[PDB]
């Protein structure tokens, strides 16, 4: 549950991401994979990437970064009213991709990390707070659908 003030901050921060969605998406996935190597194993099309340089050079990783952040952005722009958008993601990630909720926590923190890295001094305390709450909301609603499905 975010206030409109907090949503305003979220979408303001998101404007930074949309100015370069591929570059942001790329660094988020790289931060995830290098921070938490077990996550790489969930991607049959990235598990070949043994080094970060290979990750950096991968146009398909950048492409997937775009898909992921485009989806997240569409969800954030709903300001919490995202049941329709979120349910198919929850379902594919529990039933097909088999992504534990822990990894959604991982990528949440990775987003925070990347924003600070790309916008040092331009991602204030209030902005971080709002974005964090937004990602928690996202995660919590996915977690509800996981429980429904009995997925661990």
Annotated binding residues: 64, 93
| Total site size for ligand HEM, rule CB under 6 A | 16
Instruction: Tell whether the torsion through CA atoms of 91, 152, 146 and 31 is positive or negative.
Output: negative
Q: Select the span of 15-23, 54-62, 98-106, 118-126 touching ligand HEM (CB under 6 A).
A: 98-106
Residues 73 and 18: beta-carbon distance below 8 Å? yes
Q: Does 110 bind ligand HEM (CB under 6 A)?
A: no
d(C-alpha 50, C-alpha 52), whole Å:
7
Q: Does 133 bind ligand HEM (CB under 6 A)?
A: no
Q: Which residues in 22-61 contact ligand HEM (CB under 6 A)?
A: 39, 42-43, 45
Residues 27 and 36: beta-carbon distance below 8 Å? no
Q: Does 71 bind ligand HEM (CB under 6 A)?
A: yes
Q: Is 112 exposed, middle or buried (0-12, 13-18, 19+ CB in 10 A)?
A: middle
Q: Which of 13, 17, 30, 89 binds ligand HEM (CB under 6 A)?
A: 89
Q: Which of 49, 55, 72, 90 binds ligand HEM (CB under 6 A)?
A: 72
Q: Who's near 11: CB < 8 A, 6+ residues apart?
A: 76, 77
Q: Does 104 bind ligand HEM (CB under 6 A)?
A: yes
């Amino acid at each position: 549950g975010l206030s409109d003030g907090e949503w305003q901050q979220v979408l303001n921060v998101w404007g930074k991401v949309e100015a370069d969605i591929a570059g942001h998406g790329q660094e988020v996935l790289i931060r995830l994979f290098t921070g938490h190597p077990e996550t790489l194993e969930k991607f049959d099309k990235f598990k070949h990437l043994k080094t970060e340089a290979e990750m950096k050079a991968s146009e398909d990783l950048k492409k997937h970064g775009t898909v992921v952040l485009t989806a997240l952005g569409g969800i954030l722009k709903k300001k919490g009213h995202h049941e329709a958008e979120l349910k198919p993601l929850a379902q594919s990630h529990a039933t097909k991709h088999k992504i534990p909720i822990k990894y959604l926590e991982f990528i949440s923190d990775a987003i925070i990390h990347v924003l600070h890295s790309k916008h040092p001094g331009d991602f204030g305390a209030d902005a971080q707070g709002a974005m964090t709450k937004a990602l928690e909301l996202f995660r919590n609603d996915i977690a509800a659908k996981y429980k429904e499905l009995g997925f661990q």
